[PDB]
A paper describes a structure:
To better understand the relationship between crescentin and IF proteins, and the filaments they form, we have determined the three-dimensional structure of crescentin filaments by cryo-EM.
CreSsat contains a stretch of three amino acids (Ser, Ala, and Thr; SAT), inserted before residue 406, to remove the stutter that locally disrupts the continuity of the heptad-repeat coiled coil. Crescentin also contains a stutter (residues 406–409), and we have investigated the consequences of removing it by reverting the repeat pattern back to regular heptad repeats by inserting three residues, Ser, Ala, and Thr (SAT), before position 406 (9). Cryo-EM analysis revealed that for both versions of CreS, purified CreS-MB13 complex at pH 8 polymerizes into regular, unbundled filaments upon lowering the pH to 6.5 in the presence of detergents, such as CHAPS. For cryo-EM structure determination of CreS, we treated nodes as single particles, using a box size of ~420 Å (henceforth referred to as “small box”), to obtain well-resolved reconstructions of CreS bound with NB13 molecules. The best small box and large box reconstructions were of CreSsat complexed with NB13, determined at nominal resolutions of 3.34 Å (3.79 Å against the fitted atomic model) and 4.11 Å (4.75 Å against the fitted atomic model), respectively. Because the megabody bound close to the C terminus of crescentin and all N- and C-terminal ends in the crescentin filament are located in close proximity, this enabled us to obtain a reliable structure of that part at close to 3.3 Å resolution. The atomic structure of CreSwt resembles that of CreSsat, with only minor differences in regions near and following the stutter.
Author numbering:
A (entry chain H): 403 to 441
B (entry chain I): 2 to 13, 789 to 887
C (entry chain G): 403 to 445
D (entry chain J), G (entry chain D), H (entry chain C): 1 to 13, 789 to 887
E (entry chain B): 350 to 446
F (entry chain A): 350 to 445
I (entry chain F), J (entry chain E): 85 to 163
The structure:
C-alpha cells in the first residue's frame, strides 16, 4: 500500500547514480585513457 | 542474448549505426557503443540508459548521438560530422542482468 | 501487489548493473594509472 | 548536502585504517568510493562500496585493501593491509547521493 | 880526346835511354789522368744521385707530416662522433630502462 | 882534337837535368796515384752513404704504408659509425 | 686553402653523379668525402676516397654508390646508381688538407 | 699481430691510472685507443693518443682524463682524475698496427 | 698460416741479396785494380821489349865494329 | 693477395739468384783472365830485367874492348 512509494525512491536515487557513473566513465574510459596515451 | 549491428561501410559525412537486440522492450539497462581503431585498444563512444540519459566521450561530444527506439527494440548511434580519425570498428555492448554482452562488430572507415 | 513485484526486479537490476558498471572502473583506472606511469619517461 | 570528513591518517614503517565520516544517509549509502592523490600527480582510484555491499578494488591494491560499510555509525572503512611504500598519498573519500558528488578535506598516509 | 871519346858515346845512350824513359812516363801520366777522370765522372754522377734522393726524403717527410695532420683530424672527429653522438644516443635510448 | 872536348857539354846536359827532373815525374805518378786512391776511398764512402739513405727511404716508404694502413681502416671505422647513427636515427622514424 | 665546389645536383625519377671541384691539391689528395644533410636532419657521411684510392662507404649506400677520384682534373666523383626517394638530400663535399677541414657550398639532390 | 694487456684496474670511493702494455712497435706507434663498455651497453671510445703525442678525448671525459704515451716501457697510459660514479665500465685498450685492429681483455673498474 | 714458410724464403732471398751486393762490389774493385795493374804491366813489358830490340841491335853493331877494328890492328902490325 | 704477392717476392729471390750467376760470370771471365795475365807478364818482367842487366854488362865490356882497341890502333899507327 504505502511501501510502493519508497520503491520509486529506490528507483529514482539508484538510477540517478548510474548517470554519474556513466559521466565519470566518459572522462576515464574514453577520454583520459585515449588522450593521455597520445601524450 | 544476441546483439547484431549494422550500418557499417566505407564512405566519403554522417552515418547511422543500429544494434539489434533480442528481447527486453525498455527493460535492459546501460547500452553502449565501443570502437577500436586498428592498432589501438577498444574504447567507449556512447552510453544510453533505461530512462534515456545519455553521454559521450569528449572525443566525440557534439557529434555522435546515442538513441533508443523501444518499439523497434534497437539502440541507434547517429554518427555525424565524421572525421578521418573515426575509422574504427564499432561494436555494440550491453549490460543485461549484469553479464556484459557484445556484438559481431561492424567497421566504418572514412577518408 | 503485482505492480510492486515488478518494482523488485528493476531494483534488483539497477543494483546489479551498478555492480558490473563499477567493475569496469576498477579495470579502467588500472590502465589510466598505467598510462600516467608512462609520464615518468617524460618527467 | 552530505558532508564527508576523512580520517585515519598517520605514518608507518604496516597496516593502517581509514574512515570517512558521513553527515547523513543511514542505510541509504550508495556509492562511497575512496580516492588517493599521489603527490604532484592526479587523483586515484582505490575501491568502491554500495548500499548492497558489492565492493571492488583497483588492480594495484586488489587483494590487500578491504572497504566495508558501517551503516549504524555512518562511515565507510578503507582498510590498508600488506602495505607498500608506494602508498604515500593524500587520501580523500567520495560520495554520490541524489546524483551529486561530495568530497572531503582529505587526509594523508605516509608509508616510508 | 884520349878518354873523352867514350864519354861522348856513353852519355848519348845515357841521354837516349832517358830520352825514351820520358816518353814512357808521359804516357804513364796521360793514362793516370784518364783514370782520374773516370773516377771524377763516377763521383759526380753519384753526387747528383745522392742529391736526388735528398729531396726524395724531403718529399717523404712532407708526406709524413701531412699524413699525420689528417689522422689528427680523423681522431678528433671520432671524438665527437664516437663519444658524443653514440653515448648520448644510448643515453637517450635508455627509455627502455 | 876539338869537336870532342866540346861535344861532351851537350851530352852531360841530358844526364844531369833529366836525372833530377824525371824524379819530379815520378812524384806526380805517386801524386796522381794518391788522388786516385783518395777518390777511390770516397767512392766506397759514398756507396755506404748510398746504403744508409737507401734504407732511410725504404723506412719512410714503410711509414707511409703504415700511415695509410691506419687511414684505410680508420675511415672504415667511421663508415660503420655512420651506419650506427643512421640505423639508430632510423629508430626515431617509428616514433616521429 | 682548398676551395671546393659541388656540381651535378638536380632531380631524378635511376642514376645521378656528383662532383667536388677542388681548387688546389693536384694529386696531393688525402681524404675527400661526401656528406648529405637530410632535409630537417643532420649531416652524415656517405663515401670516402683517399690518395691511394681506398674507397669505403656507409652501409646505407654500400653496393649502390661509387666514390671515384679523378686526380688529373682536380675533382672527386660520387657516382649515384639505383636510387630511392630516401636519397632526397642536400649533398656536400668535404676535404682534409694540412689538417684543416674544408666544406663545399653544396648542391641539392631531390629524388622522388 | 699484437697482444694488448691492461693494468691499473680497481675500486675506490678517488682517482685512477689505467695503463696498457703492448707486444711490439717501440715508438713506431700509430693510433692506440682506450675504450670502455658500460654493462649491457655497446663498447665506446674515450681517449686516443697517437704516436706523436697528439691526444683527443670524448666530451664526457675531457678536463678529467689524460692519456699519455710511454715509448720506452712499450706501454700507453690513461690517467683518470676526479673519477665520477658514472664512469664505471670495462676498459679495453686498443691499437691499429698494420691496418687491422687488435684488442685487449679489459679491466672492470668500479667507482661508487 | 703459410706466411711462416713464405717469409722464411723471403729472408733467405734478402740474405742472398746481401751476398750479391758484397761479392759483386768486392769483385768489381778487385777487377778494376787487376785491369789497371795489367795495363801498367803490359806497358812496362813493351817498353822493355823496345829496349831489348834497340840494344840487341846496338850489341851486334858494336861487335861488328870491334871485329873490323881488330882487323885494322892486324893490318897495321903487318905494316 | 699476399699469397701471389710474396710468391712473386720469392720469384724476385730467383731473379737475384740469376744475378748470382752474373757475379760468378764476372769472376769466371774477368778476374780469372786478369790475374792469369798479370802473373804471366810479371814473370816476363823479371826475365826481361835480368836480361837487361846482362845486356848492360855486355855493352860495357865490349865498349871497353873498343876503347882498348882504339888505343892500340892509335899507338900502332903512330908507329
Amino acid at each position: 500500500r504505502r511501501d510502493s512509494a519508497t520503491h520509486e525512491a529506490k528507483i529514482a536515487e539508484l538510477q540517478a547514480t548510474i548517470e554519474r557513473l556513466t559521466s565519470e566513465a566518459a572522462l576515464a574510459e574514453g577520454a583520459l585513457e585515449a588522450a593521455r596515451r597520445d601524450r | 542474448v544476441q546483439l547484431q549491428e549494422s550500418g557499417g561501410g566505407l564512405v566519403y559525412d554522417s552515418l547511422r549505426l543500429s544494434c539489434a537486440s533480442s528481447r527486453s522492450i525498455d527493460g535492459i539497462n546501460i547500452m553502449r557503443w565501443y570502437r577500436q581503431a586498428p592498432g589501438k585498444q577498444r574504447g567507449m563512444v556512447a552510453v544510453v540508459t533505461g530512462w534515456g540519459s545519455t553521454n559521450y566521450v569528449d572525443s566525440v561530444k557534439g557529434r555522435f548521438i546515442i538513441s533508443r527506439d523501444s518499439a523497434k527494440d534497437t539502440v541507434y548511434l547517429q554518427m555525424n560530422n565524421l572525421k578521418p580519425e573515426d575509422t574504427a570498428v564499432y561494436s555494440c555492448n550491453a549490460i543485461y542482468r549484469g553479464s556484459e554482452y557484445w556484438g559481431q562488430g561492424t567497421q566504418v572507415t572514412v577518408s
